[PDB]
Each structure stands twice: as C-alpha cells, then as structure tokens.
Design a protein around this ligand. Sequence first.
Ligand code: VLB
Ligand code: POU
Ligand code: EP
Ligand code: GDP
Ligand code: MG
Lengths: 429, 69
Amino acid sequence: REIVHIQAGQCGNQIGAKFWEVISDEHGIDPTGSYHGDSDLQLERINVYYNEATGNKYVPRAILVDLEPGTMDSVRSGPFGQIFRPDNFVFGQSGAGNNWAKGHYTEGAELVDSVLDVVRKESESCDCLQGFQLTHSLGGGTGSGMGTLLISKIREEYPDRIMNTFSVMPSPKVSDTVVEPYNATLSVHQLVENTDETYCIDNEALYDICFRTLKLTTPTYGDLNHLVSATMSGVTTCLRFPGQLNADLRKLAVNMVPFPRLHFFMPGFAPLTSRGSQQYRALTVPELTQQMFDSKNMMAACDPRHGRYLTVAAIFRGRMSMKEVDEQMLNVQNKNSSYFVEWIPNNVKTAVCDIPPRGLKMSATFIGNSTAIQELFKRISEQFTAMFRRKAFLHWYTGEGMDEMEFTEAESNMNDLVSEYQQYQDATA
Amino acid sequence: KREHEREVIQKAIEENNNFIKMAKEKLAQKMESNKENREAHLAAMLERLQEKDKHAEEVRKNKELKEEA
Ligand SMILES: CC[C@]1(O)C[C@@H]2CN(CCc3c([nH]c4ccccc34)[C@@](C(=O)OC)(c3cc4c(cc3OC)N(C)[C@H]3[C@@](O)(C(=O)OC)[C@H](OC(C)=O)[C@]5(CC)C=CCN6CC[C@]43[C@@H]65)C2)C1
Ligand SMILES: CC[C@@H](/C=C(/C)[C@@H]1C[C@@H](OC)C[C@H](O)C(C)(C)[C@@]2(O)O[C@@H](C[C@H](OC)[C@@H](O)C(=O)O1)C[C@@H](OC)[C@@H]2O)CO
Ligand SMILES: C/C(=C\c1csc(C)n1)[C@H]1C[C@H]2O[C@H]2CCC[C@@H](C)[C@H](O)[C@@H](C)C(=O)C(C)(C)[C@@H](O)CC(=O)O1
Ligand SMILES: Nc1nc2c(ncn2[C@@H]2O[C@H](COP(=O)(O)OP(=O)(O)O)[C@@H](O)[C@H]2O)c(=O)[nH]1
Ligand SMILES: [Mg+2]
C-alpha cells in the first residue's frame, strides 16, 4: 500500500519535484494540498503516495535530501513547493563537489542520521508499508554517493521491503565533469547489491530524443526532466489507480526479475513527436505500439535489437479498446519473436488504465528487461578504465580516505554484471 | 559496510592530521637551523674582527718596547 519517496541531490530533487507536480495534477491535488478533482477513481489509491492530514489535506510522503541548500530553496519556491511537509527537508551546507566519496563517506556521514529519522517517522505512519523509491543521479556526489549510503542504511532497518530507484546515468553529451564515470561506477556497484528494481534513465538517451527526434536545438534540463516525469507517471500508474491489476511493487519485482542481479529496467514512453504539424494528428493503437518498441524510443541508450528481452511490462492509458491493444501487442511478439527469449513463456504483459496523462488522449509506457542494457554499462566502463588505467583524478577520492581497491572491485562487479547479461543473450532452449 | 564507513572517515581524519603535523615539524626545524646558521655566521665574522683588535694592541705594546732604546 504505502510507499515512502526519497529524492537526493540536485538531479534527484529536480526530477522528484516534477514527479510530484505531475501526479498531483493527475490526482486532482492543487499546490496547497486540497483535493479539487472530479472522479473518485483520483482518491481510490491516493494513500499510496500521500499522507492524509487534518482538514482534507493530502501531503506527499516525500523526503527531500541534499548536502547544499541551493536546490532546497529552488524546490521550496516553485510550483507545488508549498505542498511538501516542512519537517521533511534535510539539507547541509558543505556540498559534495560532485565527489562520490564526500557524499558516501565524509560529508554525508553527518547528515545521514537526520534523514533516517524522517524516514523512520514516515514509515511508522503507514498502514502497511510496501517499500521505498529514490530519485537521484549517478554522476554527481550527493545523489550518487549519499543516495547509495541511504539505500544501504534503509535496507538494514527494513530488510524485507522493496527498494526501487529511478537512477539517471551520466553522459558526456550532457555534462562537462570529468569524474562522472567514477561516481557512476561506484554507484552501480551499490545498486546491484542493494536495490530490487532500478529504472535506468540515461541522459545520453534523453539527449538523443530531444535533439534528434524532438528537434530541440538547445535542450535544457527542463526538457529532459519533462520526459522523465512522463515516464515516471506511466510506470507508477498501476500503483495509483485501480483496475484489472491487483499489483504492487513486490509482484512487479517477482515477475520482472528472473535473476537477482538482473534488475535494471529499460524504460520508454509514447507518444514522442516533434513540433508541431504532427502534434495534432490522432494517435492509433497500432502507432503507439510500434513507437513503444522502437529502439530509438528507448530511454537507455542501448539497441534492444542487439539483444533479447527477458521480461516486458507495457501500460496503456486512455480511452481505447482492449481488443485492439491485445492484437497489436501479440502482433509485435509473433512477428518479432526472436527478440524475446523462449525459455520464459508469455513474457510480455499488458495493463490498461482508463485515466490518460494530462495533455494526451492516449499514451503507452514501456518497461523492458533486456540483455542489451549491457551496452550502457560497457559505455560507462570504457570511460572508467581509460581514466583509472593511469589513476587520473584519483586524488580527489583518496583525499577523502578511499582506497584504490574500492575502485577495482567496483569496476570488477560491473564487468561481471556485463558478463551475466551476455550469457542469457546466447542462452537457448 | 558500517565498519568500513568508519574506517574511511577515520583515515581521512588521519591523513589530514599527518599533513598538519609534518608541515608543523618541517617548519619548526627550518626556523631552528636558520637561527643557528645565521648566528654562527655572525659569530664567525665578529670573532675575526676581535682577532684584529688583539693584533692592534699587540702593535701598541710592540711600539713601546722599541721605545726604550
Ligand atoms: C540538457 C542540459 C544541457 O542544457 C545540455 C547541453 C549542455 N549543458 C548546458 C547548456 C549548453 C549547451 N552548449 C553550451 C555551450 C556553452 C554553455 C552552455 C551550453 C548545449 C547546447 O548547445 O544547447 C543548449 C550542448 C552542449 C553540448 C552538446 C550539445 C549541446 O546542445 C546541442 N554536445 C553534445 C556536447 C559536445 O561535447 C559534443 O560532443 O559535440 C556535439 C559539444 O561539443 C561541440 C563541439 O559541440 C560541447 C558544446 C559546447 C563542447 C564541449 C562541452 N560539451 C558538453 C556537452 C556538449 C558540449 C546543451 C546542459
Ligand atoms: C520489437 C523487437 C525489437 C526490434 C524490432 C524487430 C522492431 C520491430 C518493430 O518495432 C516497432 C518494428 C515495426 O515492425 C516496423 C517495421 C513496422 C517499424 O515500426 O519499424 C520502425 C523501425 C525500427 O527501428 C528501431 C525497427 O528497426 C525496430 O525497432 O523493429 C519504423 C518503421 O521501420 C520501417 C516501421 O514502421 C525492438 O523492441
Ligand atoms: C510527443 C507528445 C505528444 C503527442 C504526440 S502525437 C500528439 C497528438 N501529441 C508529448 C510527449 C509527452 O511525454 C512528454 C515528453 C515531451 C517533451 C516536450 C515537452 C518537449 O520538450 C517539447 C519540445 C515538445 O515536444 C512539445 C512542447 C511540442 C510537446 O507538446 C510535444 C511532446 O513531445 O509532448
Ligand atoms: N536528467 C537530468 N540530469 C541532471 C539534472 N541535474 C543534474 N543532472 C545530471 O546529474 C549529474 C550530476 O549530479 P547532480 O545531481 O548535479 O549532483 P549532486 O547534487 O551531487 O547529486 C550529471 O550527469 C548531470 O547531467 C536534471 O535536472 N536532469
Ligand atoms: Mg551540480
């Protein structure tokens, strides 16, 4: 039932805020936490993400963390910034300097217990807490280093709850900072061991979509983040709205993750169409379905045609006949059955929800668990070793007390993870 | 993991303490050597000047000895 949400660092707080902004609009909540909705379908499951305060006020079950105040003020002074519980702001002053070691071991060490206190206070207010969700980037210092420290501490207090993260991978196409492959590799190591489900949101993929597909010549984080919030709303539809699915996070993990370490998901969203003459066409289910599976629509920069899907979850939203959706989804599998492993029968599932996202008559959200995600970890691995071969920029991390061995076993873990994906790409029945 | 997290933070504290400690000690020992070295250079030069004052007075005694003949 209840989910506790944590956003850490600049990126995590940025996309975390847009997420609450978007789903608040869907559930008919205004920026002061009052309900102004029509359908009651919007309150059926409102308690999943919102706490009910005195006076018919719904407040997000959200914890906001950062090692510097800047983004705290930014969120607090924005649209839907007043909706958040004021106790649930936990920030420092030092900042992490895009340094994983500062977030994970030195500066974050002091703030971490304050966060666990708010986490603990929210968990005890839950009827039956099902688990946690974290938004953060892997390329920085706070969301990457301190976000993973939070995951580790939270898992130790709630060892049987589901742990789920929306994790933004770094790309040289978007960001300037040379040490990002270092931060990401240390983070991936923590994620393979302490999360149950991780959505891989690749800034490299988000950039190609905005630049190539959407024709945005000067992409901003606001553009990228509006893709992320749309996808985050889509993948959480079946938690926040009733209908045909009696599903929570654990059931999703059980049916999406056939092997413990292989829990990194490839997300996608339809529709995506550049401005503007095509923005007025009516979307048909056949078109939604082809777009959803198109490699160029994927939100992790990896070619799904290079590998195989272990499992797929697809969710459609809006007014549409389920018969059309059924036929179309079966068409994709029957006509391209070599891209789905045959040792997992009937391994693509569909859910349809009546309420559509704001601004769209229809939409589809894609959750793919594909062996091709290895391309993402290979890319980060290449950048890592090019630098680590010569111990370049290592002093920023050893000056915080870290050893070289810790880097060696992080790259080691990621290389094995790559190997594991490769072995089911060639596994046959 | 928790033992290691304390390990790392305590190692950061120790490397910073050792940095301060060595700078402190290197500086202290350099001020010390320079004091000794400069004071010795001056003592040498002054010891030499007095050795000349000694010779002058001997030049005066020498004048009177020949002065009695
Ligand atoms: C989405 C967030 C973003 O706005 C995305 C880009 C980068 N930054 C901020 C804004 C920005 C951009 N360019 C800037 C130049 C000066 C100051 C700021 C910018 C941005 C853009 O043009 O649209 C707004 C951008 C940036 C780049 C960018 C594209 C881009 O917008 C299209 N490139 C992908 C890289 C780049 O390194 C590259 O690989 O070549 C294409 C690129 O190189 C060249 C020769 O263009 C370039 C351009 C300054 C060079 C060195 C540093 N790298 C980092 C990323 C890259 C850039 C957009 C963050
Ligand atoms: C589905 C498995 C795995 C790859 C395959 C085989 C998928 C199949 C179907 O996916 C929608 C494609 C579909 O049948 C079509 C050919 C009608 C179609 O939509 O293809 C895309 C081109 C796409 O480029 C990426 C293609 O290469 C691709 O992704 O193919 C536009 C256009 O091309 C002519 C055409 O309208 C992706 O999950
Ligand atoms: C492609 C879209 C709609 C659409 C497709 S066909 C039709 C009748 N409508 C939606 C997609 C939404 O998931 C959201 C992400 C889109 C990002 C945009 C905000 C983008 O930054 C911007 C440049 C745009 O593309 C428009 C503002 C033109 C946007 O309305 C169209 C779009 O992509 O939104
Ligand atoms: N998609 C997206 N990525 C972001 C955003 N802000 C920062 N990033 C990325 O996050 C990485 C830097 O981490 P950041 O969140 O700034 O650092 P932190 O505050 O130390 O966690 C880089 O790869 C940035 O491109 C954002 O709003 N959206
Ligand atoms: Mg930053």
